[PDB]
PDB file of C-alpha atoms and ligand atoms in Angstrom:
ATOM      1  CA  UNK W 213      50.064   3.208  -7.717  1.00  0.00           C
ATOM      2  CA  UNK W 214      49.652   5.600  -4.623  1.00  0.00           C
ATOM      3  CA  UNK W 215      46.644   6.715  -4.059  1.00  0.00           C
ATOM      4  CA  UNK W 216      46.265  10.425  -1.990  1.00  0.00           C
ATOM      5  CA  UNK W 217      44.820  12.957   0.253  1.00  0.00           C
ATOM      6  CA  UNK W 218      41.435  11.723   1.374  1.00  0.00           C
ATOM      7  CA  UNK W 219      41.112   8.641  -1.175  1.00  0.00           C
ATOM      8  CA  UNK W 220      43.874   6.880   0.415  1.00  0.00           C
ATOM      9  CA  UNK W 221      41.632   6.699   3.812  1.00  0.00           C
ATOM     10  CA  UNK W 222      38.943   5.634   1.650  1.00  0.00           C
ATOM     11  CA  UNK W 223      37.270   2.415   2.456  1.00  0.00           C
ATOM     12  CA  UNK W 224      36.303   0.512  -0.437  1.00  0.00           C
ATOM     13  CA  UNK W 225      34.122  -1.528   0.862  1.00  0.00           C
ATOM     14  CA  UNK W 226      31.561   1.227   1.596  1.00  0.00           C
ATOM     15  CA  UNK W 227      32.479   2.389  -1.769  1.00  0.00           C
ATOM     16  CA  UNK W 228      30.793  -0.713  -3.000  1.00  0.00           C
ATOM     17  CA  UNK W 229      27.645  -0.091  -0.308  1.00  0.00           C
ATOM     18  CA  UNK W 230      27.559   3.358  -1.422  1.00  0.00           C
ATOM     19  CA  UNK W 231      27.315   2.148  -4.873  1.00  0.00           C
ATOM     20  CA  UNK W 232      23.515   0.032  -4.163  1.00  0.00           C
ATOM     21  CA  UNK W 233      20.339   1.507  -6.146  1.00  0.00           C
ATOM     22  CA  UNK W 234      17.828   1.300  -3.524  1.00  0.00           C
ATOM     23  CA  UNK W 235      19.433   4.070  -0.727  1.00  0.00           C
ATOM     24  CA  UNK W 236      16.766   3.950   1.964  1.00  0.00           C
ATOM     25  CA  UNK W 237      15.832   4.583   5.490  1.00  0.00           C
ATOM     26  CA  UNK W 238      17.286   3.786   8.529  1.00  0.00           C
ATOM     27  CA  UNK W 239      15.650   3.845  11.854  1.00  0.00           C
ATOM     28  CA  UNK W 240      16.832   6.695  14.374  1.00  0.00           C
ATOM     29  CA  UNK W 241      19.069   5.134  17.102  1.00  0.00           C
ATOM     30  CA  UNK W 242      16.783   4.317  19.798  1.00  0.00           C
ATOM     31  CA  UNK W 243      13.697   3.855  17.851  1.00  0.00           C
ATOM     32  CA  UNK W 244      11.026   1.816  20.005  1.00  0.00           C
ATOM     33  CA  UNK W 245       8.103   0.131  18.614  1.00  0.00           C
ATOM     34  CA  UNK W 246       5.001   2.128  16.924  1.00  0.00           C
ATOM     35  CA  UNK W 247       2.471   1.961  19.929  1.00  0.00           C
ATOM     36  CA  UNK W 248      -0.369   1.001  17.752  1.00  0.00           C
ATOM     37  CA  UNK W 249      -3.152   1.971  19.020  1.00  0.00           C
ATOM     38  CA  UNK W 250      -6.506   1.915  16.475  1.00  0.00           C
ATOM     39  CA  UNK W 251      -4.439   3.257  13.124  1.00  0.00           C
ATOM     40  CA  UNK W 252      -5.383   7.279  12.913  1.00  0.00           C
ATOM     41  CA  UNK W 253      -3.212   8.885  10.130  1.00  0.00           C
ATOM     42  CA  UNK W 254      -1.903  12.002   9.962  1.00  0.00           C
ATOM     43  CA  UNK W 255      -0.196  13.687   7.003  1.00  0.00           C
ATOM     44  CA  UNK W 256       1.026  17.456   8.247  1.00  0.00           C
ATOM     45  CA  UNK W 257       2.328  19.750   5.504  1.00  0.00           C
ATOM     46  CA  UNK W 258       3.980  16.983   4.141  1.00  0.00           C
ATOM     47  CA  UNK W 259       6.260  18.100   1.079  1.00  0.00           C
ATOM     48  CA  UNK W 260       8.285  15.668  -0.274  1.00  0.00           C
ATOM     49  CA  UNK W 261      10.741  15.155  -3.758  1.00  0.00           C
ATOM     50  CA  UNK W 262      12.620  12.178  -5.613  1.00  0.00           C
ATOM     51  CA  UNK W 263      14.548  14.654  -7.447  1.00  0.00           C
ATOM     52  CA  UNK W 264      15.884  18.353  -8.435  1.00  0.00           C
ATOM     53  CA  UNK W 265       9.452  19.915  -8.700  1.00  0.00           C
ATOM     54  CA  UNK W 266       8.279  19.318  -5.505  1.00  0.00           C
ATOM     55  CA  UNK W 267       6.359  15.484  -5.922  1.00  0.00           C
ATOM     56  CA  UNK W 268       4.174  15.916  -3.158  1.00  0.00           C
ATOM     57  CA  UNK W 269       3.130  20.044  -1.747  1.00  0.00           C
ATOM     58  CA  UNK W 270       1.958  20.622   1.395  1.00  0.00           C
ATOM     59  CA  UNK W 271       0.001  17.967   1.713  1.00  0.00           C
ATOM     60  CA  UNK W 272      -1.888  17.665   5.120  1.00  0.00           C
ATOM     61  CA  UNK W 273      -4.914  15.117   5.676  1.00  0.00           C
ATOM     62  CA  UNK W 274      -6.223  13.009   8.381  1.00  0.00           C
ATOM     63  CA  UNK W 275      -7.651   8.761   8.264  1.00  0.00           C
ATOM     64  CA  UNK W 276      -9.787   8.110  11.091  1.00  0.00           C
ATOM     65  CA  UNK W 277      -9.492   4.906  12.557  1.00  0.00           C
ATOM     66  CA  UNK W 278     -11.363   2.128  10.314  1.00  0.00           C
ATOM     67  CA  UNK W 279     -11.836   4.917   7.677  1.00  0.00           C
ATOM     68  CA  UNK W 280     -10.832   4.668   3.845  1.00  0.00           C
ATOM     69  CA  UNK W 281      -9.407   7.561   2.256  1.00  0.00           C
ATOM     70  CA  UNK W 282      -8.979   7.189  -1.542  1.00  0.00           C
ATOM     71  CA  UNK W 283      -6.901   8.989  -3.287  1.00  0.00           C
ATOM     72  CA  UNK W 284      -7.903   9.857  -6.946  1.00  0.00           C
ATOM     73  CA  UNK W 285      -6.013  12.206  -9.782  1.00  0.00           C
ATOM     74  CA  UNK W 286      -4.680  12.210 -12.902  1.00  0.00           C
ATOM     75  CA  UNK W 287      -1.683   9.547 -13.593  1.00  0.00           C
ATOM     76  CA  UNK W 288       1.772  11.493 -12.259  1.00  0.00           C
ATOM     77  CA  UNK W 289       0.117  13.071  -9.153  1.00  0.00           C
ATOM     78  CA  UNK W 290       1.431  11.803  -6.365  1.00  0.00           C
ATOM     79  CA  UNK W 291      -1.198   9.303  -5.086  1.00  0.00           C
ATOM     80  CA  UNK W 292       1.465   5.978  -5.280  1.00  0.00           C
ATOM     81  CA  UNK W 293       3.619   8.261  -3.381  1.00  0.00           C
ATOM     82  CA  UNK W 294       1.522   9.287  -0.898  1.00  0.00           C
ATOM     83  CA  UNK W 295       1.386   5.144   0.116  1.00  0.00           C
ATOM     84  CA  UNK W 296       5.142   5.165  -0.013  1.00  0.00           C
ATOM     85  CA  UNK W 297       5.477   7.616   2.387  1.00  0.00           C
ATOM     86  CA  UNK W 298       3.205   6.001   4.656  1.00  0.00           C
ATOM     87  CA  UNK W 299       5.302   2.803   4.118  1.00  0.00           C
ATOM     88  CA  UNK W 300       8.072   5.234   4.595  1.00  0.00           C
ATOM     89  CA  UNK W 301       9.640   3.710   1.507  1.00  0.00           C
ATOM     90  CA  UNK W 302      11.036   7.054   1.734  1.00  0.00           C
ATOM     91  CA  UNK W 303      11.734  10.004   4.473  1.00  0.00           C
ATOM     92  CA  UNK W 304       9.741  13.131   3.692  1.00  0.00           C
ATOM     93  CA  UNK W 305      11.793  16.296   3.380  1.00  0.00           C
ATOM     94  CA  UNK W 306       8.858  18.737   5.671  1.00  0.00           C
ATOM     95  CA  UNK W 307       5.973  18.143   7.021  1.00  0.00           C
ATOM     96  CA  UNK W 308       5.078  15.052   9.739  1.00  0.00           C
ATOM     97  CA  UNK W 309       3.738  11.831   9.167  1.00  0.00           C
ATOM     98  CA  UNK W 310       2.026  10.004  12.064  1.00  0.00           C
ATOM     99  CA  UNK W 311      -0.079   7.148  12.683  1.00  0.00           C
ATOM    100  CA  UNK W 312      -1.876   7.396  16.549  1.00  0.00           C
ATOM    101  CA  UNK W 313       0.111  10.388  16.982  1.00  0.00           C
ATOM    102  CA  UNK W 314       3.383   9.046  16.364  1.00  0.00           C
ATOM    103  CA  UNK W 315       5.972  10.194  13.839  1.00  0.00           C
ATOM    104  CA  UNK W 316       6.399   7.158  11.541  1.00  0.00           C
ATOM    105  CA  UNK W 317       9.762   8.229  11.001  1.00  0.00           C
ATOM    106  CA  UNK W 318      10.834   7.909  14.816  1.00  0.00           C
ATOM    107  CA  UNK W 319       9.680   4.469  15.260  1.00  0.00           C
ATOM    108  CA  UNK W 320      11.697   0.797  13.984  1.00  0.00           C
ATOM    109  CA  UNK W 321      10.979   0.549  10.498  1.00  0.00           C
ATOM    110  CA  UNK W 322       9.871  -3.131  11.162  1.00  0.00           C
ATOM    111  CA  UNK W 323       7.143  -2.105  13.693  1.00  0.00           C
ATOM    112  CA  UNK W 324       5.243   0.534  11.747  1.00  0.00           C
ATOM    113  CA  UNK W 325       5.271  -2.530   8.563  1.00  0.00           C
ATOM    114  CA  UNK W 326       3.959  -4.662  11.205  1.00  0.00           C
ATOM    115  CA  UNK W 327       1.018  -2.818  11.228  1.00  0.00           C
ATOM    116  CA  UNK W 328       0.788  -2.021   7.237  1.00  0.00           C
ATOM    117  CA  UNK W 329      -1.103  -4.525   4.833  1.00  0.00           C
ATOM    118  CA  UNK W 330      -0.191  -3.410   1.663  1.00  0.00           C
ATOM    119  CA  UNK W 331      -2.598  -4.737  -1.345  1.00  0.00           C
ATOM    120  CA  UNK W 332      -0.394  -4.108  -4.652  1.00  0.00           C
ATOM    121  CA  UNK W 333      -1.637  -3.893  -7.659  1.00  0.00           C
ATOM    122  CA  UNK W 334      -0.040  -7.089  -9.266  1.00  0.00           C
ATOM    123  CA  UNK W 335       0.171 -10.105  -6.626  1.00  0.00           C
ATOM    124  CA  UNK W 336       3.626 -11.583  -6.420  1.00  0.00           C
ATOM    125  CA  UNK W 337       3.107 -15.350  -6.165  1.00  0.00           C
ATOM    126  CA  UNK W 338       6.768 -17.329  -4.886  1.00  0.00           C
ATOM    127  CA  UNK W 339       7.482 -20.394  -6.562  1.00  0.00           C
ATOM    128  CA  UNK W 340       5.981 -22.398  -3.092  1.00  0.00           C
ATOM    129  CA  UNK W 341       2.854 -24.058  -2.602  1.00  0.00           C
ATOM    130  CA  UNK W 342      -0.159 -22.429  -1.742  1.00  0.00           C
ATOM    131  CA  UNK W 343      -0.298 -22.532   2.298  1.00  0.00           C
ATOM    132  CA  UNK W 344       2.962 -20.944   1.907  1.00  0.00           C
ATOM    133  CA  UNK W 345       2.367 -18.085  -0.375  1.00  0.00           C
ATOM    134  CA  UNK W 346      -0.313 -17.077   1.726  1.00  0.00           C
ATOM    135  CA  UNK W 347       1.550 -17.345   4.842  1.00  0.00           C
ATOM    136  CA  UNK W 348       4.252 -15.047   3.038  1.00  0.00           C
ATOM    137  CA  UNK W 349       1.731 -12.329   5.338  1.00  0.00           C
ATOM    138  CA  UNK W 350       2.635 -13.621   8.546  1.00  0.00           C
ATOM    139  CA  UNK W 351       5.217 -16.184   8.597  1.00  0.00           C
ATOM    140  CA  UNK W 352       4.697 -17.558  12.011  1.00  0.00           C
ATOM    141  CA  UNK W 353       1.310 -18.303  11.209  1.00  0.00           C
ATOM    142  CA  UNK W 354      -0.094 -22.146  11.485  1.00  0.00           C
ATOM    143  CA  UNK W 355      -1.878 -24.049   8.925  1.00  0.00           C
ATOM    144  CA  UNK W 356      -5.522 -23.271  11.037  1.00  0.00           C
ATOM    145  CA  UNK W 357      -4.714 -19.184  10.682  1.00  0.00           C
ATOM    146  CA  UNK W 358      -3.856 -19.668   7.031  1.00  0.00           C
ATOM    147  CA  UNK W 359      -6.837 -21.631   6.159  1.00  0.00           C
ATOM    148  CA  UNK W 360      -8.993 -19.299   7.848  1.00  0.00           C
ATOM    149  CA  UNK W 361      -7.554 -15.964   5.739  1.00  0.00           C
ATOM    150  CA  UNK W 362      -8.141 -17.982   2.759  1.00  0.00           C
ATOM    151  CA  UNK W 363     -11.826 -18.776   3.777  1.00  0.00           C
ATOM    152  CA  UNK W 364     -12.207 -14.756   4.687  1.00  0.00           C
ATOM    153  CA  UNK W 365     -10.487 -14.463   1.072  1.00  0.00           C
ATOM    154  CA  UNK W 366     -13.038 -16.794  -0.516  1.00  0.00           C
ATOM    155  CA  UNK W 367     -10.164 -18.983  -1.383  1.00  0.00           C
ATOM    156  CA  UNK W 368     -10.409 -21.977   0.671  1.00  0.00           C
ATOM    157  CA  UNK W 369     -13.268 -23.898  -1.842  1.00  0.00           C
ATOM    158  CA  UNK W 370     -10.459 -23.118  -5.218  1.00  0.00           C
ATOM    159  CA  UNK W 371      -7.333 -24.418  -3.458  1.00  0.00           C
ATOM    160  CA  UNK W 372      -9.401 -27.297  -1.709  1.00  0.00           C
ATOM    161  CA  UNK W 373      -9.755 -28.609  -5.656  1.00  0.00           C
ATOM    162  CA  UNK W 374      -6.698 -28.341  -6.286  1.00  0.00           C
ATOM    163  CA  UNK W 375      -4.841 -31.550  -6.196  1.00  0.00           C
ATOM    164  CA  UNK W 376      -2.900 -31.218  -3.186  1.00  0.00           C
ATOM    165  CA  UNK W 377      -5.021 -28.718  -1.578  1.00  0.00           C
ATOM    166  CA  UNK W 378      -3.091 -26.216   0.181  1.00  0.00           C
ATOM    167  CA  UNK W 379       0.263 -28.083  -0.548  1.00  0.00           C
ATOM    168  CA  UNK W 380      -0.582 -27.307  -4.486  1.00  0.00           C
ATOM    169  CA  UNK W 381       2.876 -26.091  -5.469  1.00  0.00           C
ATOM    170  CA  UNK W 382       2.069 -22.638  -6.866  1.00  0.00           C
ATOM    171  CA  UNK W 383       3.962 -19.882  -9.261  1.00  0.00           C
ATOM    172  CA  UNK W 384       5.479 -20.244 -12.497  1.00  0.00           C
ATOM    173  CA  UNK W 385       7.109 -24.369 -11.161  1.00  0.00           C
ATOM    174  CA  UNK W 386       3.077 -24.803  -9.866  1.00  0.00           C
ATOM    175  CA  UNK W 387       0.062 -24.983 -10.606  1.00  0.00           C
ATOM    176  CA  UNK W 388      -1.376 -21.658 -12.674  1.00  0.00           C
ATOM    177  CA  UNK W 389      -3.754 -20.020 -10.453  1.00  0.00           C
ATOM    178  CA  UNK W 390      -6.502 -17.846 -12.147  1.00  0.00           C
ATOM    179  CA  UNK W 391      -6.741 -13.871 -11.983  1.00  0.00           C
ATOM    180  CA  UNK W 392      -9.374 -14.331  -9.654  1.00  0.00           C
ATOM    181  CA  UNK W 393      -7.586 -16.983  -7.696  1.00  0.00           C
ATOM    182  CA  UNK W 394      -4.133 -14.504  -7.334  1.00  0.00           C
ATOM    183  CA  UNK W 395      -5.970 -11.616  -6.441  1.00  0.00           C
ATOM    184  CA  UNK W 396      -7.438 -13.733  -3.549  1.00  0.00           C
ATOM    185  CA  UNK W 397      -4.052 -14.702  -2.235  1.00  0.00           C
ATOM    186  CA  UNK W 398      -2.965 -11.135  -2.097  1.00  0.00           C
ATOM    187  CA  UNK W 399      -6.495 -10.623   0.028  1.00  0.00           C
ATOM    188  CA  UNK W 400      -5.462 -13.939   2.390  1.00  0.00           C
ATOM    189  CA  UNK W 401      -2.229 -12.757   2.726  1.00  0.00           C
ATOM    190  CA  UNK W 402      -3.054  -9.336   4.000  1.00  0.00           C
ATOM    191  CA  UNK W 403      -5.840 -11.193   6.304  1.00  0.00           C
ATOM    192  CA  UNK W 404      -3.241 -13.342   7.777  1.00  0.00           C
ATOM    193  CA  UNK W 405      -1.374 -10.394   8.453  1.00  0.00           C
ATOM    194  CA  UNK W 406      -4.665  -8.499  10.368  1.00  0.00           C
ATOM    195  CA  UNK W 407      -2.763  -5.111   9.865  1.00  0.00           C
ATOM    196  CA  UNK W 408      -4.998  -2.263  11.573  1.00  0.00           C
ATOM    197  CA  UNK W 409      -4.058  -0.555   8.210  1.00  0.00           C
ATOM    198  CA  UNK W 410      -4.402  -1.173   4.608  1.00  0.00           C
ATOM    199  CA  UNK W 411      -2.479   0.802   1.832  1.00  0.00           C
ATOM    200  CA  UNK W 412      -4.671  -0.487  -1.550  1.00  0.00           C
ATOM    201  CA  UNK W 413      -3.103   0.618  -4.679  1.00  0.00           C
ATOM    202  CA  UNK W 414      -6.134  -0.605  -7.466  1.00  0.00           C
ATOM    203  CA  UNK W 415      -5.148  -2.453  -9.968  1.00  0.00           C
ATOM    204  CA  UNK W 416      -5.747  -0.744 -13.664  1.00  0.00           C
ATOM    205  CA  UNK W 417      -6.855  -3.787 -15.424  1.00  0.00           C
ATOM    206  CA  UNK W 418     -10.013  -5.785 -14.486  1.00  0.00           C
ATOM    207  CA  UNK W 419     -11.623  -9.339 -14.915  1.00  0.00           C
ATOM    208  CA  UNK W 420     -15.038  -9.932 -15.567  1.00  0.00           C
ATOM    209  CA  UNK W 421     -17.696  -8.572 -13.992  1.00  0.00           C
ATOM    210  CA  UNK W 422     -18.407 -11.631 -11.693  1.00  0.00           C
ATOM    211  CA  UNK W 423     -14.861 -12.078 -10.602  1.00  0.00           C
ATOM    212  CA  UNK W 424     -14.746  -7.703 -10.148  1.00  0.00           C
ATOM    213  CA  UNK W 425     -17.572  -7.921  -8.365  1.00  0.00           C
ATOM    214  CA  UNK W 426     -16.184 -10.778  -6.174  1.00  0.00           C
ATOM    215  CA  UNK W 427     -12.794  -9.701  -5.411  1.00  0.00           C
ATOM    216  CA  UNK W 428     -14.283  -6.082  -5.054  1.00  0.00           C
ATOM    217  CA  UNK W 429     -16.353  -7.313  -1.775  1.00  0.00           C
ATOM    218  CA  UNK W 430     -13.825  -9.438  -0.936  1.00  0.00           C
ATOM    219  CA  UNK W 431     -11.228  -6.445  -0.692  1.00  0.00           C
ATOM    220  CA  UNK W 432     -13.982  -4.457   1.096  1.00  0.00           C
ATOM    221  CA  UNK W 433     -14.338  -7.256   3.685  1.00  0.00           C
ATOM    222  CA  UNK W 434     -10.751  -6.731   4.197  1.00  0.00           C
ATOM    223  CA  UNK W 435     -10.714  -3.079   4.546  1.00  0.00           C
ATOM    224  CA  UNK W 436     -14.183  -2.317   6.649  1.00  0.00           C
ATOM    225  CA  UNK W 437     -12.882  -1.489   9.893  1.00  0.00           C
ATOM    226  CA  UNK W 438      -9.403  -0.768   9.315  1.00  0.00           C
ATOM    227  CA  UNK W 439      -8.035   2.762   8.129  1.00  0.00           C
ATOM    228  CA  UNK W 440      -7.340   2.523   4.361  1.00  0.00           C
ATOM    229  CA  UNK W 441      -5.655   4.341   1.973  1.00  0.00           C
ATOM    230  CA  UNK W 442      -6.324   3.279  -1.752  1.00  0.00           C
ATOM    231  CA  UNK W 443      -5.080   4.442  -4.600  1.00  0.00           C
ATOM    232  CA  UNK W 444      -8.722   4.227  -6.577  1.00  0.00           C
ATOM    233  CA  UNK W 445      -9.086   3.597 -10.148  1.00  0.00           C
ATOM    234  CA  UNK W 446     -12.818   1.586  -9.257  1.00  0.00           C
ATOM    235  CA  UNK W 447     -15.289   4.105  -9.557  1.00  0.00           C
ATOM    236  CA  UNK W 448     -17.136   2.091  -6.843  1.00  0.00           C
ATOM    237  CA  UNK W 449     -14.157   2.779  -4.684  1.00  0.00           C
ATOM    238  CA  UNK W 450     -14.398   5.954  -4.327  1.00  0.00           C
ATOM    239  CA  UNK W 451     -18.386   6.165  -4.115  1.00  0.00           C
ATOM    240  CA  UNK W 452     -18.258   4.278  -1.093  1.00  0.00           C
ATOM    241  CA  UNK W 453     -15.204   5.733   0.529  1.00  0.00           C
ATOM    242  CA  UNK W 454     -15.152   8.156   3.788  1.00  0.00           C
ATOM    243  CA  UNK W 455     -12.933  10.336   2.233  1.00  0.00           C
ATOM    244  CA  UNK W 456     -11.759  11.492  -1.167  1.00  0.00           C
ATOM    245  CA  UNK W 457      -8.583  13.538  -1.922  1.00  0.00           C
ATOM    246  CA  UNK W 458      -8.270  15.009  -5.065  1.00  0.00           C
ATOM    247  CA  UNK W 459      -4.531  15.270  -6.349  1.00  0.00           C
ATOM    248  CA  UNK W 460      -3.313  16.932  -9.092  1.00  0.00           C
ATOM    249  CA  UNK W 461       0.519  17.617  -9.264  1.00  0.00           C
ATOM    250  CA  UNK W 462       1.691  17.432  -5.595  1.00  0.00           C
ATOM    251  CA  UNK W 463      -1.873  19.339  -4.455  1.00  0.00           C
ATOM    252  CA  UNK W 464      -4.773  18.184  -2.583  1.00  0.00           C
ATOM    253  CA  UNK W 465      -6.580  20.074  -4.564  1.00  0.00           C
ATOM    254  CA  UNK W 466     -10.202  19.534  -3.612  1.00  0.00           C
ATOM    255  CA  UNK W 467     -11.698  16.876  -0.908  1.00  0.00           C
ATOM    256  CA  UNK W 468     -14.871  15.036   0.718  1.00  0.00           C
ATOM    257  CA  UNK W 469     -16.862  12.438   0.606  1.00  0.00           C
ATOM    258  CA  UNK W 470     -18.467  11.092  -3.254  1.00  0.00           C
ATOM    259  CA  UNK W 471     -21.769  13.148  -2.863  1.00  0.00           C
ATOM    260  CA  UNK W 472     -20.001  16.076  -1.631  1.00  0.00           C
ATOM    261  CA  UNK W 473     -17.429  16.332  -4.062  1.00  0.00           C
ATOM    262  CA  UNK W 474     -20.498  15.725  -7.220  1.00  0.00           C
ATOM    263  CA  UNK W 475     -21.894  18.904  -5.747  1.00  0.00           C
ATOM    264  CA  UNK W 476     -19.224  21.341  -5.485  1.00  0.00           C
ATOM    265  CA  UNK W 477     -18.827  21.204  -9.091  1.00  0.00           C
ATOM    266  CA  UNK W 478     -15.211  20.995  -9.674  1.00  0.00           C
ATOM    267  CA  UNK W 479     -12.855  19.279 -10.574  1.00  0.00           C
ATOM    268  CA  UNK W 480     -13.574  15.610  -9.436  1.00  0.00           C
ATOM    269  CA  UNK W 481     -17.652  16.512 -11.110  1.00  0.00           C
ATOM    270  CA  UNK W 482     -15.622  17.118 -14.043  1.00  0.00           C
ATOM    271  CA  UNK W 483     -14.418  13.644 -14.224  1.00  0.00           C
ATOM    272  CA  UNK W 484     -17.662  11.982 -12.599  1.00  0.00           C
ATOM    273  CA  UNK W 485     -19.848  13.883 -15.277  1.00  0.00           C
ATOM    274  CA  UNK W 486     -17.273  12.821 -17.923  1.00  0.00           C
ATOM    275  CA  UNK W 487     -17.407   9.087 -17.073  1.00  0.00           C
ATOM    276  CA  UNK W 488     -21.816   9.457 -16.867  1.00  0.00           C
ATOM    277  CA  UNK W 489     -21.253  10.632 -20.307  1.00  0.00           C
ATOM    278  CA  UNK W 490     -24.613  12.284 -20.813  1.00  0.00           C
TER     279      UNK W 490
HETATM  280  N1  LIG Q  20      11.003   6.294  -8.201  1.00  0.00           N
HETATM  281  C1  LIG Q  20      10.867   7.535  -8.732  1.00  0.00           C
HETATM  282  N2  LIG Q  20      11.883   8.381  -9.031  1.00  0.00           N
HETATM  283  C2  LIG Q  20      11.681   9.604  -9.540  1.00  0.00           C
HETATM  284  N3  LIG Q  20      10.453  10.111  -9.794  1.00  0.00           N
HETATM  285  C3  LIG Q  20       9.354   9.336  -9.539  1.00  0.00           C
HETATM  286  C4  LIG Q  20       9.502   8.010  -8.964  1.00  0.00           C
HETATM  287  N4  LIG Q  20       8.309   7.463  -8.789  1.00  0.00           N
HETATM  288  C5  LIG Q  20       7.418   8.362  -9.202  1.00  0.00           C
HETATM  289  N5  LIG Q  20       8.038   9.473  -9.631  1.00  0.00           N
HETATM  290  C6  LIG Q  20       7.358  10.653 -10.130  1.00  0.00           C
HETATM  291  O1  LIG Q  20       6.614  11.191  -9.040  1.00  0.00           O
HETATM  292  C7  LIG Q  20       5.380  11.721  -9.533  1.00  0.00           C
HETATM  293  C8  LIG Q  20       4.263  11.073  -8.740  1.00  0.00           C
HETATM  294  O2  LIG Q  20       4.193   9.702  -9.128  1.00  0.00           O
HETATM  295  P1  LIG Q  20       3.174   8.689  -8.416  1.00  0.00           P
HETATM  296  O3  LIG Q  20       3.162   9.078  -6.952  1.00  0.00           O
HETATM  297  O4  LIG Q  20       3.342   7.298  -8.890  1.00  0.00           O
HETATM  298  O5  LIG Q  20       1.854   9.244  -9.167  1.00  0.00           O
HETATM  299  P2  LIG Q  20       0.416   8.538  -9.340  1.00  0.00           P
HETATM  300  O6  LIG Q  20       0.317   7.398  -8.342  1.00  0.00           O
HETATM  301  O7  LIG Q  20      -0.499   9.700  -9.006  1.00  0.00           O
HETATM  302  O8  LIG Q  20       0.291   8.294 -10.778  1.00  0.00           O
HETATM  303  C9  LIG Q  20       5.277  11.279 -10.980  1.00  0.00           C
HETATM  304  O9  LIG Q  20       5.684  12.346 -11.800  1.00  0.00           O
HETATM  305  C10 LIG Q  20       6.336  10.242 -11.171  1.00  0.00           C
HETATM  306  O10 LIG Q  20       6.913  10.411 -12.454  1.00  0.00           O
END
């Protein structure tokens, strides 16, 4: 029976709350909405852990507006994190994190999303038809807006053969959609949204070259004037970017553009001159 000393002013209800997986981030009282302004990012002497090393060291780099930054290293780095933390999927232990000089962390949680397209690696498709999954990006969005993110996806012609067109009951109840054609969604989705930034995290497997090639100007529609981070695996990704960070446990540990980085002769030649394969 009786329970004592602190435990018997113990609620258990929070005991239960305590007890969820998933122990995030809560907006500071007062929080007012990101003032977006044209998405410049700021990473200041970030640090940041999940655990006990140090996942992410000092890590300080800026996205101009409508620039892509792609992040490259080997797996275990820190580059998924890096998007997290943008996300703020998690609060950063030092360092500041801003986006138009604004700490993302002082801002509603739902504002600085607002602003965030995030392009998984896998597309989730909902067990809804088409129009809908694509609206998943902006939910308030009418039929016109989602047609026309599916014509900037160059998915409009596929769902309009379909059989119900855009009412084609999609997902694992629906109608399978191809690699290609889930890809696109993801694309349309994030169009919808118009975010003024794009967090791209590659996917490590590939289709054929048509539907690559495809998808991989269709992404870079997407991203061309909006400040992108991407998690690269493509090599073409990271040819073509503004900027490249080199990570390699927690560490930027080299940077610049493609050409740049092939002429300093370190550690991202290494892998370029590996993957030439003289
Ligand atoms: N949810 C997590 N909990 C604990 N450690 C994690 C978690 N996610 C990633 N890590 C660790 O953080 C380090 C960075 O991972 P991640 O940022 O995904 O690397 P990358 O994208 O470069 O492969 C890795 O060692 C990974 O094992």
């Amino acid at each position: 029976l009786v329970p004592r000393g602190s435990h018997m002013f113990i609620d258990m209800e929070n005991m239960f709350d305590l007890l969820k997986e998933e122990t995030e981030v809560k907006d500071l009282p007062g929080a007012g909405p990101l003032r977006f302004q044209k998405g410049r990012i700021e990473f200041e002497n970030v640090h940041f852990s999940y655990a006990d090393r140090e996942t992410l060291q000092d890590v300080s780099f800026t996205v101009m507006p409508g620039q892509t930054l792609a992040l490259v290293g080997p797996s275990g780095a820190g580059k998924s994190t890096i998007l997290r933390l943008l996300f703020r999927f998690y609060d950063i232990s030092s360092g500041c994190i801003r986006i138009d000089g604004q700490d993302i962390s002082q801002v509603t949680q739902a504002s600085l999303r607002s602003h965030i397209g995030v392009v998984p690696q896998d597309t989730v498709l909902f067990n809804d038809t088409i129009a809908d999954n694509i609206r998943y990006g902006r939910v308030t969005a009418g039929n016109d807006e989602v047609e026309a993110a599916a014509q900037a996806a160059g998915i409009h012609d596929a769902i309009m053969a379909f059989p119900e067109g855009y009412r084609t009951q999609v997902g694992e109840r629906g109608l399978k959609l191809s690699g290609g054609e889930k890809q696109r969604v993801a694309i349309a989705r994030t169009i919808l949204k118009a975010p003024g930034i794009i967090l791209l995290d590659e996917a490590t497997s590939a289709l054929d070259t048509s539907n690559e090639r495809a998808i991989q100007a269709s992404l870079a529609k997407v991203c061309a004037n909006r400040t992108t981070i991407v998690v690269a695996h493509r090599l073409s990704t990271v040819v073509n970017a503004d900027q490249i960070l080199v990570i390699k446990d927690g560490c930027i540990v080299e940077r610049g553009r493609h050409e740049a980085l092939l002429s300093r002769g370190g550690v991202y030649a290494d892998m370029w001159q590996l993957q030439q394969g003289q």
